Amino acid sequence: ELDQLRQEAEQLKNQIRDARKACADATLSQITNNIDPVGRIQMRTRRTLRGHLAKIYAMHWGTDSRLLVSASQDGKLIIWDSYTTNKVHAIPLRSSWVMTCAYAPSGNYVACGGLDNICSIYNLKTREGNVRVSRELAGHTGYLSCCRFLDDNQIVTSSGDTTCALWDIETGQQTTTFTGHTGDVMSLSLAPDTRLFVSGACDASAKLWDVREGMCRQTFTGHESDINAICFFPNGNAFATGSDDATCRLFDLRADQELMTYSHDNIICGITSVSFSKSGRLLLAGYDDFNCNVWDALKADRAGVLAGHDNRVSCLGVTDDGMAVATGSWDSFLKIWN
Amino acid sequence: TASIAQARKLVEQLKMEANIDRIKVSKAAADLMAYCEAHAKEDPLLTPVPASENPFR
Amino acid sequence: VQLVESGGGLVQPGGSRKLSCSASGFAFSSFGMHWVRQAPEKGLEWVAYISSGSGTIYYADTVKGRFTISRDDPKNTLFLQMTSLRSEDTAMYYCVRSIYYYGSSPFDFWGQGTTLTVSSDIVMTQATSSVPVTPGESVSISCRSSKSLLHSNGNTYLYWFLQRPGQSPQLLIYRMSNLASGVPDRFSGSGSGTAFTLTISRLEAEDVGVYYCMQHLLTFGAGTKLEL
Amino acid sequence: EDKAAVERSKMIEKQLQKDKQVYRRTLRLLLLGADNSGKSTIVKQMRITSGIFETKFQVDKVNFHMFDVGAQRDERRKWIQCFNDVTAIIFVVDSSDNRLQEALNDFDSIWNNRWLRTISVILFLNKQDLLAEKVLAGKSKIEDYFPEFARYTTPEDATPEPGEDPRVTRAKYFIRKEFVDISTASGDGRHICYPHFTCAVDTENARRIFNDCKDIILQMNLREYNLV
Amino acid sequence: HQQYVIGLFLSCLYTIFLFPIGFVGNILILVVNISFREKMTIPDLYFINLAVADLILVADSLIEVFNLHERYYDIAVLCTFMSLFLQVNMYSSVFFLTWMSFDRYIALARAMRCSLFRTKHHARLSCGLIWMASVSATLVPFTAVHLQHDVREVQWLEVTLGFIVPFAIIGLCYSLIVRVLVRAHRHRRRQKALRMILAVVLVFFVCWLPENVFISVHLLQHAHPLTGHIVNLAAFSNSCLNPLIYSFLGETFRDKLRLYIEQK
Incomplete structure (x- = not known):
């Protein structure tokens, strides 16, 4: 039984690969010669946010494009007014090993999680004036890698126990558990339409999921070792990736295969974060090299570098407005670029 | 006994992935390039803005 | 609270x-x-x-x-x-x-x-001390300031208060554009920088009182009363 | 006014300094070991679904935070990157166990990890009590799994505890030497392994951790001050 | 005549052996530490300040070589400037050595439970205060003598503050550090540090004792040209040797120097 099923699965995999090869009548590099290269993109540190005691692990801009929450391994979430550097809040955490943080799209809540396997929801607007733990979403059997709000009531989270899940915050239950990954799930990106989301795992594969149906739709595998970061192209039909294999990859949902890979032979270190600019023309990735490289998403050539960090660049984000780019590092300083 | 179930559900997932339709990579690349070009005028990071426009400096 | x-x-x-x-x-x-x-x-x-x-x-x-x-x-x-x-x-x-x-x-x-x-301070004024009105419709209340309240940061430091008979003043709108927490959709505000307006979309008998305007660029206005 | 926002920010920064003092005063420790190892008994006897556990204990006016990782996938390729730049890693093995080769492989993986290349390891050869009578009885022979023990004799620098049969000393020092050779092969001098013959009932575990942390900080400052 | 021959022979020996080490090593320490100023640690502050002071002292020693002082003896303001600058800089060198001995004692014997004191802000404040103490000890005697009237008591204060107290503190602190190291190494490579610590104290003692003994003799009593030249050269040898034995006889600064070579 097992051998026959393996043969059938291999036949299906061969069919999928043949279909993808047939669809690859052209590659992005040939098409993108029709557009002018972006050229030299230079950004300067407009702000430097300090106050975190230890390594910064995560950060997330608010939809207002001004406030941004940040997390550090010392057990603090600090909300910054990036314009003025004012510390709007400072939330002490139950567990100091926080690996992710999110800002609710409405701006009312922030979430965080880490090696505690619990996604804590914090209410930034309560009549007592303090910041209160609204919910403690428990049920994952591994550390939390990423989380992103869908609504004030729904949040999707990745875990190191190979599962992503969708949570109903009010009831504190898992609406639907996503399974199929074989290794630790390291990051997830929520589509602009909010109906689909894609997560990369410690295996070579990044999988696309449908929250309404609660099941994987397709899988991508064009990576060598381990996917650390993932981001959705602004149009929502493509997503980037970052791996320990020291290269980015651009996939397309409709084509269902790799479109482009961004790497230079002199970059031999893993990628910790990935993000796109507002138009999607620039692909920004943070590396263990202590600096972030700006890639031309179409021409696939480096257009800049953000080297103003003293340690591993662990997180990276771009404002919904597209004005600025934030970055966090293990040196405990966030820096807004532009 | 139980491993057969996991193998069969894996086969079902692969079957579904096979049944999905796909488009030519040329059209996907054209769509992404068109998207980038249409919005290239609204991306501050792509085309630098004057100091009077950006709110940071 | x-x-x-x-x-x-x-x-x-x-x-x-x-x-x-x-x-x-x-x-x-x-x-x-x-x-x-x-x-x-x-x-x-x-x-x-x-x-x-x-x-x-x-x-x-x-x-x-x-x-x-x-x-x-x-x-x-x-x-x-x-x-x-x-x-x-x-x-x-x-x-x-x-x-x-x-x-x-x-x-x-x-x-x-x-x-x-x-037994010097900032001076403000309001259009009218009293304004007879009835429920079920909207009305406009306006006020003026000696100097523009629009600071270089890009916002106006003005607030609106409602004082019902026997009740303490309640915050309706802050910074001329943000409704308070718990205030219904019965209120709105707008301005140009030196003259501001408080508009009640739909009046109700439960909101009887006097309205005060305050700036925080603290002094209050003369107060405008609604007579139902 | 936005000045009150700056005041709020500065109260926040005052609190951040206040807890920065505490953060810098405390020493963090990572606890590792297999389920056979009695690390749980060690932490429980620290007389001052969820993931990391925490134990707070103090020895001679200096406090420690020890982090025992609980419900997680058997792999630690990623979550051990968080525990970089801790003071020390405490590794606990069951000497009496045979899974000894599994413990050796685990220690190899920890020692050679690229993110823990500067973190000293406080190695607890735990459960000496069981090992002692396991060797004394003779019902099992360590040579079955490590035949090199047959042609091995205790070194000259060994210091057996007051009173000990030669065979138990030989066995315990053979295991300790296995771990020590593992440590030294890749040891470049940037981190050190501190082996200890420990049992969960021993009360010196806190003292041993404190002494090894004192030495680790001594060497860190010595390296900082260019003296090495 | 052979007196002059010996003097010139020692001068050329110094300018060949010690002057290159001093000047180049201090310049290199400054360059390396400045290149990575963002990541600088507490010791690097003291090493930077000591490098500055020793660099100025060794640059000054060129005037001592070949006896070039006469070109500046003829201008009073320049005379006072040079003399007080040399005084403040040698005071800063000796005081920074004395302060590094105590700071090392705090960092090694009280490595923990003293994190509340060793803070880079406090390190920079202490560097400023060391420069302040140097300036004060150089100037207060000067202005006091100028108002009231090289004074006997002024030079007694000079000898005390410049050798007797600094050396006592250095010896005590490094003896305590050596006790710490010998007790640590007896249990759980560390001899490298031990002999470095026994070398710094010896270099300080050998290079500074001659001039202070000479000054004490003169106070208890010109006419000693060769002895004065020898003691001056021995004193400058301290500022010449400090860069080596403090920065690039140890591994950490050599690591940073290799990083400077490769990255830049």
Whole structure:
């Protein structure tokens, strides 16, 4: 039984690969010669946010494009007014090993999680004036890698126990558990339409999921070792990736295969974060090299570098407005670029 | 006994992935390039803005 | 959330008294504290301000030096000593909650207050002292300021208060564009920088009172009343 | 006014300094070991679904935070990157166990990890009590799994505890030497392994951790001050 | 005549052996530490300040070589400037050595439970205060003598503050550090540090004792040209040797130097 099923699965995999090869009548590099290269993109540190005691692990801009929450391994979430550097809040955490943080799209809540396997929801607007733990979403059997709000009531989270899940915050239950990954799930990106989301795992594969149906739709595998970061192209039909294999990859949902890979032979270190600019023309990735490289998403050539960090660049984000780019590092300083 | 179930559900997932339709990579690349070009005028990071426009400096 | 002031009564002009209030239901330590007096048959007047953490302290020139404000975070008690009193100082004093950060709503809560009876500043004006109206429709209330309240940061420091009969003032709109927490969709506001307007989309009998405009670039307007 | 926002920010920064002092005063420790190892008994006897556990204990006016990782996938390729730049890693093995080769492989993986190349390891050869009578009885022979033990004799620098049969000393020092050779092969001098013959009942575990942390900080400062 | 021959022979020996080490090593320490100023640690502050002081002292020693002082003896303001600058800089060198001995004692004997004191802000404040103490000890005697009237008591204060107290503190602190190291190494490579610590104290003692003994003799009593030249050269040898034995006889600064070579 097992051998026959393996043969059938291999036949299906061969069919999928043949279909993808047939669809690859052209590659992005040939098409993108029709557009002018972006050229030299230079950004300067407009702000430097300090106050975190230890390594910064995560950060997330608010939809207002001004406030941004940040997390550090010392057990603090600090909300910054990036314009003025004012510390709007400072939330002490139950567990100091926080690996992710999110800002609710409405701006009312922030979430965080880490090696505690619990996604804590914090209410930034309560009549007592303090910041209160609204919910403690428990049920994952591994550390939390990423989380992103869908609504004030729904949040999707990745875990190191190979599962992503969708949570109903009010009831504190898992609406639907996503399974199929074989290794630790390291990051997830929520589509602009909010109906689909894609997560990369410690295996070579990044999988696309449908929250309404609660099941994987397709899988991508064009990576060598381990996917650390993932981001959705602004149009929502493509997503980037970052791996320990020291290269980015651009996939397309409709084509269902790799479109482009961004790497230079002199970059031999893993990628910790990935993000796109507002138009999607620039692909920004943070590396263990202590600096972030700006890639031309179409021409696939480096257009800049953000080297103003003293340690591993662990997180990276771009404002919904597209004005600025934030970055966090293990040196405990966030820096807004532009 | 139980491993057969996991193998069969894996086969079902692969079957579904096979049944999905796909488009030519040329059209996907054209769509992404068109998207980038249409919005290239609204991306501050792509085309630098004057100091009077950006709110940071 | 509950603020109850204590003290008041009858004191001779040469005497002194200490007004005390106890904060309950919220983190009094993080909330800034303002004192606002409501003298008989006239509008509100700011008295003093103490920042959270017993930091910056301000007094109105009318009461500068005469009064001193003290704060006690661990006991959640606010104190205000009046060394000497004049006849004009008689007024009902409120305990106004306030916290300041990007997106906050200062002056959101006003305490019950106590009545104390005894045996340059920015000037603003309102279009009319009274405006007869009926429920089921909208009306417009406007006010003017001596100088533009639009600071270089890109926002106007003005607030609107509603004082119902026998009830403390309530924050309706802050910064001319943001509705308070809990206020219904019955109110809206707009302005150009020097003249602002408060518009009630649909009036109801439960909102009877007098409206005050205040700037925080603290002085209050003459007050506009609605006669149903 | 936005000045009150700056005041709020500065109270926040005052609190951040206040807890920065505490953060810098405390020493963090990572606890590792297989389920056979009695690390749970070690932490429980620290007389001062969820993931990391925490134990707070103090020895001679210096405190420690020990982090025992609980419910997680058997792999630690990623979550051990968080525990970089801790003071030390405490590794606990069951000497009496045969899974000894599994423990050796685990210690190899920890020692050679690229993110822990500067973190000294406090190695607890736990459960000496069981090992002692396991060797004395002779019901099992360590040579079955490590035949090199047949042609091995205790070194000259060994210091057996007061009173010990030669065979138990030989076995315990053979296991300790296995681990020590593992440590030294890749050991470049940037981190050191501190083996200890420990049992969960021993009360010196806190003292041993404190002494090894004292030496680790001594060497860190010595390297900082260019003395090595 | 052979007196002059010996003097010139020692001068050329110094300019060949010690002057290159001093000047180049201090310049290199400055360059390396400045290149990575963002990541600088507490010791690097003291090493930077000591490098500055020793660099100025060794640059000054060129005037001592070949006896070039006469070109500046003729201008009073220049005379006072040079003399007081040399005084403040040698005071800063000796005081920074004395302060590094105590700071090392704090960092090694009280490595923990003293994190509340060793803070880079406090390190920079202490560097400023060391420069302040140097300036004060150089100037207060000067202005006092100028108002009241090289004074006997002034030079007694000079000898005390410049050798006797600094050396006592250095010896005590490094003896305590050596006790710490010998007790640590007896249980759980560390001899490298031990002999480095026994070398710094020896270099300081050998290079500074001659001039102070000479000055004490003169105070208890010109006419000693060769002895003065020898003691001056021995004193400058301290500022010449400090860069080596403090920065690039140890591994950490060599690591940073290799990083400077490769990255830049």
